[PDB]
Amino acid sequence: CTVGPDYRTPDTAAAKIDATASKPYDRSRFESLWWKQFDDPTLNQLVEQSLSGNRDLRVAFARLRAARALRDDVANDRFPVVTSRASADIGKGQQPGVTEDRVNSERYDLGLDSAWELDLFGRIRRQLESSDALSEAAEADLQQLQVSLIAELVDAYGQLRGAQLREKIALSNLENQKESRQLTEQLRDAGVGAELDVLRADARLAATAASVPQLQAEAERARHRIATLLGQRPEELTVDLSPRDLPAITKALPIGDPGELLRRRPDIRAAERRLAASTADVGVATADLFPRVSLSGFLGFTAGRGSQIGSSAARAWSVGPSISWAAFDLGSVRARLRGAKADADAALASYEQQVLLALEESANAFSDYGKRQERLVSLVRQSEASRAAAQQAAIRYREGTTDFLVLLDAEREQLSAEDAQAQAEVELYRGIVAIYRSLGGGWQ
Amino acid sequence: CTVGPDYRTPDTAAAKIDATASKPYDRSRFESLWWKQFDDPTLNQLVEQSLSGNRDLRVAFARLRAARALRDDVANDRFPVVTSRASADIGKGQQPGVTEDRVNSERYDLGLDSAWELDLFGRIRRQLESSDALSEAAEADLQQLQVSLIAELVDAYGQLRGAQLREKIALSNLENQKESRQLTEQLRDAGVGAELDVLRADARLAATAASVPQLQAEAERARHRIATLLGQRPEELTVDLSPRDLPAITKALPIGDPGELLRRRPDIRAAERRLAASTADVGVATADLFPRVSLSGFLGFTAGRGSQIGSSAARAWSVGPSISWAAFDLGSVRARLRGAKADADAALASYEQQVLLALEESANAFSDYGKRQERLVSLVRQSEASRAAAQQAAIRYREGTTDFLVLLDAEREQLSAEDAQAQAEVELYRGIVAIYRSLGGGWQ
Amino acid sequence: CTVGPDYRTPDTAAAKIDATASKPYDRSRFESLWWKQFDDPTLNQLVEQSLSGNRDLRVAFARLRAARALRDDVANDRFPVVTSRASADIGKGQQPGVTEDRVNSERYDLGLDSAWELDLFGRIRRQLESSDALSEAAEADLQQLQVSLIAELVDAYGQLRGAQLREKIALSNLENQKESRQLTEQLRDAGVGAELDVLRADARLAATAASVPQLQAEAERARHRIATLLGQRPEELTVDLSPRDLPAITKALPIGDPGELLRRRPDIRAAERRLAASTADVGVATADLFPRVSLSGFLGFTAGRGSQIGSSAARAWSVGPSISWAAFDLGSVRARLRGAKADADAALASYEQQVLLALEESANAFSDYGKRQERLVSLVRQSEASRAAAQQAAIRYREGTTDFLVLLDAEREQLSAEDAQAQAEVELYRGIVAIYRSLGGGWQ
Predict the structure, then answer these.
(1) Between chains, do C424 and A63 touch, taking CB under 8 Å as contact?
(2) What residues of B are in contact with residue C200 (Cβ under 8 Å)?
(3) Single residue among B273, B307, B331 that ends a domain in this structure
(4) A314, B94: Cβ pair inside 8 Å?
(5) Residue of A nearest to C14 (CA)
């Protein structure tokens, strides 16, 4: 017999995301190694090294082995437990029932003890079923951490490239603002301009200069993050991260069927396996409503005189079958059952929350990616217009045919446009990372 | 007897917040359903649906039932434990004391076993007292999560309305900047203007256009959040969230006496009940300093021949009273006592931290609300002035009587003023949410 | 005997940070009370009071005492356990083997029971070794929390001073913008200016006014934080926090040898002690591969008639030596061993992650501090230039020799320069705090 409910997987509907019909996506195939589409061999090396060196990943793998070890232990409980023992019981006292004289007592034992709960109503079977589910849950945790890790690593690499990009932009715009400052300095020294212009120019030049260490600071924080994610010290980072361009994907994104995502995501699987474990735990609690059958034994030697231990005149065996039933203490058993059922309900609600958060993350990532493309279109146009306006005002300032503020403001709007655009490009990249994270890629 | 300390509630002083005398607040009454004052029926529906569907809430309710089940189990420990059993002991060996011959042994038993610790010094009573306190702590957790949930939901709804508001502002200002761009385009084509103006106008137009997808992106993230908080998939959201205005409260806020807040807040109660549980646990540890009285029994049948089980010639009963005292192993008992007392101290310090954080949150919310009103006054004036300045510069640009930058900068300052004002209005709304969160509203 | 692996400390290389050779740092000495270099007696008082009143610190100290109590309990397990007991066994039934008559049974006992596992293979010794390591781990947690607390407190105090600084800046710039607004108002009333100027001036004046409550709001949040960190209610804060200047350190920072940091940091120590505990736990699991020796006894009185208890005719003693070996159930023992080894691997990977994060935090703090100095140099120049430009434009606006926008924009750039500089100064201060946090200062 095996009592209590048999686990059935929740019948949960597949994820529908209508935006996936749209043009930026390719539903016919899904890349598990999603990050390789960036065609960035450096990045690829980072991910490979991360899988070897990352310590959080190494922790989670040990926790899996621990969970399996626990399951292996539970697995043995089906079989009788045979131990060997040698003991004695010596004393001197009265023997109530037998005699009021203080008499000597001497007993010697050497043999195998055995003990065994027959799993008649499946209590042990339901434990093993639970323990197996948790074992599988720990494996899904390992895989989810891998998904997270890769996303964090790819995301961080993109932030480094963004900081480097923005640095160069700042440095390039700084040179315009030195040339422009040189020009204003020449016009006051020729008698035609004014110091007010030089001051404004030097102020703006200082402002742009202040951004460069800050961007350099962000970059260095991103290098430090990347190193810890690889399992390396910051000093000892084996991958060269010299400035290269920000990776892009010109192709439509291979995202596969979005309905598949709940089945691909290990966090969802882990929550489902915890639900299975807790469902099995209801069985364990239900079995205690029913009788418990056990069988003890002894095989070996028993004597009053030690010299006889090991001889055939002192051979001994014993058998002790027992069945026990909680005749009146069902109150406590039914309390534990009510607790088991509540934990199962919790695990079900938990599982459903994970499903909901996955659909939320997923909805969020696609929703953002679409909007981040749109935003980038108009930001690219701002950068174009601003470069054009800046160069016109420069001409017209040199010819004395407009005041400096026109050129000051045009240089200001050039910087912020270019910089806003670089931020938006980074955000596209991060949105790709968000997408594949939400779909459960990189653990296979 | 019941040994160890009797729990006394901490005598903690009521919250004093001097700013509550101020005009924006009404101390005569407190609205438990605080969110209904916004007069927003959509929002009301969100909260109602959230209480039904939110899975985190469903989890916490199962955890309460689990805690009660545990308490019910502990509750039984006062009574004797009677189980039924049928067993045998068969063997063949020597009988030390009796005979050196290997002899057959056969015993058969059928009856009720009973076992019972008399709770003479209140160890079990102190367990039940602990377990009851934890049970009440789990209920307070459920209520605190409800407070948090409602605040998060109302807060998120306000962010959605803010994004929608800011979107329309951006769209409205975009149209000014198209008209203005059209105008600059007309003046170059009439021979009197310049391309520099058109470029600057197209740049600024692009910048404003870039904000619209971003605001739309925020809005869509807020919808996704709201859906998960309701217990729904993003696709399946039953409440229509089409753009409507941001809710306001024209009345002074019904906040009640702020001294009441510590007594209303379930987080505080939960920490207090954990302090009570740990205080009872000192009793449990103290009881082990004292003797332990127990009583076992057997009632049924006992015989050497199985055919006799059930007959009156094989009737059997047994009684086994026992008292035990740790004569020398008080060392271990006193160690556990020292640990129990330390846990109680921890629980007390924990409780005090919760009190302090509550007063911090509370101080913060009122402090911010007051300042957010002030800020809004002057920001409304900036918006007025900026609209006026923008329309003047527009006139004077059309008449050729000022250069474009005057109109460019005036359009820029109009956008940021209007947008800063919308952000500040949202922040007022969120500050109302912060306030009622800190006072412990929505669980009743 | 003591079986299983003997713990050896991980041989981890010292932290190398090449930037420490640089001029802003002093490696010859390290200040444990690092915060006192600010020469701020108020701050010093905050830290002193925090160490007395902070409840999180009080919690962690109770948890240490609890861990020690647990170790004390485990420590007793080496010695025999002697308890006193008085019991009886009364009944009436058959005596299988002896007689088929239902006979009366009566036994009375009064004496000392003793029980003792001889720690032959060091199972108990390895428990105590584990429990001692955890005890030391809880002490390191207390010290790490102290490091964190002090850093959070000093950091928060700096944010308060920053808000106060920025407030005064805003107020000062507000007065320029009132004077400037008054001026524009005078020029329209003399017939020579225009309303467009007044509107722009009033707009900008409102904008600056909106920042003041916001900065005041931040300040008040920082006061509330500080109070909770001290263990005080916000209302009851015993330290006067009236505006004073932001603390600086003109001297090079006493950072000591950076190689020392891993040895100084308590988080690292705590992780190492958990590794030691888990290593000892492998021993505990290994001991169960080997036989278990135990010795029970009874000393006192035993009789069939109660009146005889206490008499010498009813004297009784008993000795019960036993050795047991898992002859076939090594499967379960070896499963637990495999689990123990996995936990040890986890604890090792965990320890290595802590080392890596420490080096990351550390790398980050120095890296940022250097860059934050550079940034501040150029930001100070922006503030100088902007003040100069603002005062020039003011002159040239009064003389009617430039339009208002020139003065409007110059006032705008003055405010943001001054404000950006104050933020950068605060960030320097916070970076000092980050540094000493990462080096593990303040617990000694």
Answers:
(1) no
(2) 385, 389, 410, 413
(3) B331
(4) yes
(5) A233
Q: How far is residue B48's CA from residue B50's CA, in Å, rounded to a whole number?
A: 5
DSSP result, A282-330: HHHHHHTTS-EEEEEEEEEEEESSGGGTTSGGGEEEEEEEEEEE-SSTH
Q: Which of C52, C57, C59 to mutate to test the interface with B (most CBs of B within 10 A)?
A: C59
Domain count, chain A: 2
Residue A131: which domain range? Answer: 1-79+119-289+332-444
| Closest among B443, B418, B422 to B176, alpha carbons compared | B418
In single-letter form, the type of residue at position B410 comes to: A
Amino acid at A224: H
Cβ proximity of C294 and A83 under 8 Å: no
**CATH number, position C236:** 1.20.1600.10
B303 lies in the same domain as B376: no
Angle between helices B123-189 and B41-53 (to 10 degrees): 140
Min Cα–Cα distance to chain B from A337, Å: 8
Contact residues, chain B, for A338 at CB < 8 Å: 65, 68-69, 72
Which token pair is A103? 């008499």
Same domain, C87 and C177: no
Nearest C-alpha neighbor of B128 from the set B76, B79, B62: B76
Q: How far apart, in whole angstroms, are the C-alpha atoms of residue A311 and residue A300?
A: 10
- Resolution at which this structure was determined, Å: 2.7
Chains contacting C with at least 3 CB pairs below 8 Å?
A, B
Q: Are residues B108 and B126 in the same domain?
A: no
- Chain-chain contact of B353 with C56 (C-beta, under 8 angstroms): yes
CA C178 to chain centre: 48
Select the residue from C301, C334, C375, C435 to test the A interface by mutation, using most A Cβ atoms within 10 A. C375
- Claim to verify: residue A62 and residue A89 sit in the same structural domain: no
What radius of gyration do chain C's Cα atoms show? 37
**How far from each other are the two terminal CA atoms of chain B, in whole angstroms?**
39
Taking CA–CA distances from A380, the nearest residue in chain B reads: B206
Identify the burial level of A196 via C-beta atoms within 10 angstroms of its C-beta, where 0-12 means exposed, 13-18 middle and 19 or more buried.
Answer: buried
* One domain for residues C198 and C303: no
B311 shares a domain with B409: no
Experimental method: X-ray
* CB contact (8 A) between residue B320 and residue C89: yes
Strand-pairing partners, residue C103, are C93
Query: Which string of DSSP letters, residue by residue, matches A53-78?
Result: H-HHHHHHHHHHHHHHHHHHHHHGGG
CB atoms under 10 Å from CB of A148, counted, come to 17
Q: Do B317 and C62 touch (CB under 8 A)?
A: no
CA–CA distance, C132 with C115 (Å, rounded to integer): 24
- Is B316:B32 a contact under the CB 8 Å cutoff? no
Q: Tell me which residue of C91, C219, C122, C109 sits closest to C164, measured CA to CA.
A: C219
Q: Which residues of B touch A311 (CB under 8 A)?
A: none
Question: How many Cα atoms are found within 13 Å in the side-chain-facing hemisphere of C157?
Answer: 31
CA distance A204 to C149: 40
Report the candidate in C110, C132, C91 with the shortest Cα–Cα distance to residue C273: C132
Q: Are C352 and C422 part of one and the same domain?
A: yes
C415: Cα separation from own chain's centroid: 38
SS3 call for C77: helix
Q: Are B218 and B167 in contact (CB under 8 A)?
A: no
CA distance B426 to chain A (A): 22
| CATH code for the domain in which residue B300 is found | 2.20.200.10
Instruction: Tell me how far apart the alpha carbons of residues C166 and C419 are, in angstroms, rounded to a whole number.
Output: 6
Given the DSSP bridges, would you call strands C99-118 and B99-118 parallel, antiparallel or unpaired? unpaired
DSSP-assigned letters across all residues of B285-319: HHHTTS-EEEEEEEEEEEESSGGGTTSGGGEEEEE
Residues C53 and C96 in one domain: no
Give C323's contacts in chain A (Cβ within 8 Å): 85-87
